[PDB]
Design a protein around this ligand. Structure first.
Ligand code: A1L46
Ligand code: A1L46
Lengths: 302, 308
């Protein structure tokens, strides 16, 4: 079964609908009135920030539940030490249900597998809350721009053809359809958990720091190894990336990116459909920055 | 010390701005992080992640005090949590932080070796977190997003540790704010949270930068030069806290916190002491200048806490 069933009913609802907490924060209707001197953007910066970093903490704690080197109780000690300062603040800043369930994950787990299910459901709960928070934060406010002269100055063969799994990526209301190959031999365990989620329809958002890249919070939590990773900057156009640590997102790189980090490789959009990604990216950039007009991503198998 | 070079950098950065913070707020970070030629999105990530990496670093420092967890187990949780935090900060304006983050997790022989690394790194990140909080642009929301004044009055309308203990054990101190030129005297409650008060008093005297609370309300915190794993048996709800209250939040940056007005936060924080009632009326002026200092002015206000 599932250790926290009420979360699962919420997780499925939140891939479709805006979470109530994301609205009350973006509408400034949080009960305790967070935010100094009659404003709520300072509370908004924290509410968006913590929930992303809290989610990343939860995943690395969930990763250690797979580890038998660290005992079950010592892991609870590590959780009960790290969780309260994150959960108590977020409950004050329009995440009360999230605060309540963090205490249940800390409650003594008879089996390590139970604790793994508590962390797995909760990490998915926070990461969907994080997904909408990345969308509705007012990134358009940043007056602070690079000089035009500064911006102006700036694995597919490896593998087996039989393991290439055909998938389609469809973005609406734009209507752009592209097909892609999922490499199931490079990261076999990772791809198996992403394939199981297909078909999934999730919201599409743009990278605020990474460059010309888009991601979407897919409905899975993968503790699977990542043997084949690729530098984000070294990636080709049409690259399908899956970043488990940043929220189990499905990442598409439709242009040159600045970030130096190494991210796991899921697959690549066919080169003939690579030209279509550039039109979607601009719309996804505007939706995250300015419009807040939802662009939904549908990934399906062929 | 395990990292003596960093202790020179911690002492240097108390007075002066770190080089990493300046290049982020001026948009001179090397790889030009951001999307479509703007460095505010990277700024929002740099400031926030270093804040949450610092809080994670302290709880790892507090994890070393517990002997139920082995060092190999403790190193493993640092080897699992840190990489996603260290590597990005190295990309987003904190390259040296990633250098010492790798050195903290190297196989340690003793608990004191790991605790000294975590204690030094945490304070180094807590000063970097301090300067990122002062210069960050919080005025952007005041122009666009504001609570209504009438709904504020209603939220206050709908809403003793000072009595506890021996008044003889309290230790007087002095907080001096420059360039405002305002002095108040305060008593530190050594009975309630003794090990904490000892750990703070040993740092006296110190002169540090003073900033405001962006979310908590009418409160101002100053990053003091210590990392305290001391027990906190007496804590108080920040919304219930009185005016002139001195608090020390070991988890949110080891800061000296002065409440000079209404605060809405429900979290409980250890009680350091209280400004004497005769000198409480001087706090209203300082916080108004401290608000503008962090909210708008970005003009340094300094705090010198000394023993009397
Ligand atoms: O893989 C890529 O190119 C994107 C990498 C990334 C992601 O969420 O996956 N981008 C996000 C952004 O700045 O917009 C933030 C972010 C990413 N890793 C991170 C690792 C640590 C902290 C933050 C991030
Ligand atoms: O203790 C106080 O007076 C206020 C409490 C607090 C602090 O400890 O600094 N305020 C800061 C703010 O919101 O601006 C940030 C902050 C505090 N707790 C926190 C817990 C989790 C995350 C952030 C914070």
């Amino acid at each position: 079964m599932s250790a926290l069933p009420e979360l699962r009913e919420l997780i499925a609802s939140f891939v479709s609908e805006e979470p109530p907490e994301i609205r009350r924060i973006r509408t400034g209707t949080v009960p305790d009135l967070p935010g100094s001197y009659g404003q709520y953007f300072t509370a908004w910066d924290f509410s968006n920030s913590i929930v992303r970093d809290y989610a990343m903490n939860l995943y690395q704690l969930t990763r250690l539940a797979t580890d038998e080197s660290v005992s079950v109780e010592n892991l609870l000690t590590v959780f009960r030490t790290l969780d309260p300062i994150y959960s108590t603040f977020l409950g004050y800043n329009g995440f009360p249900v999230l605060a309540e369930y963090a205490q249940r994950v800390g409650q003594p787990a008879e089996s390590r597998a139970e604790l793994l299910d508590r962390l797995t459901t909760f990490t998915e709960y926070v990461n969907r809350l994080t997904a909408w928070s990345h969308h509705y934060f007012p990134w358009d406010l940043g007056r602070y721009r690079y000089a035009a002269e500064e911006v102006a100055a700036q694995v597919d063969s490896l593998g087996d053809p039989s393991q290439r799994i055909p998938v389609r990526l469809t973005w609406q209301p734009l209507g752009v359809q592209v097909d892609a190959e999922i490499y199931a031999d490079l990261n076999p365990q990772l791809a198996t958990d992403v394939l199981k989620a297909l078909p999934f329809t999730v919201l599409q958002d743009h990278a605020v720091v990474s460059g010309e890249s888009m991601y979407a919070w897919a409905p899975l939590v993968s503790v699977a190894p990542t043997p084949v990773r690729e530098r984000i900057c070294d990636a080709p156009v049409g690259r399908l990336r899956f970043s488990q640590a940043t929220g189990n997102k499905v990442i598409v790189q439709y242009g040159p990116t600045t970030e130096t980090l190494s991210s796991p490789v899921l697959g690549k959009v066919v080169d003939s459909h690579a030209d279509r990604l550039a039109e979607v990216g601009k719309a996804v950039w505007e939706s995250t920055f300015s419009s807040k007009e939802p662009v939904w991503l549908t990934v399906e198998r062929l």
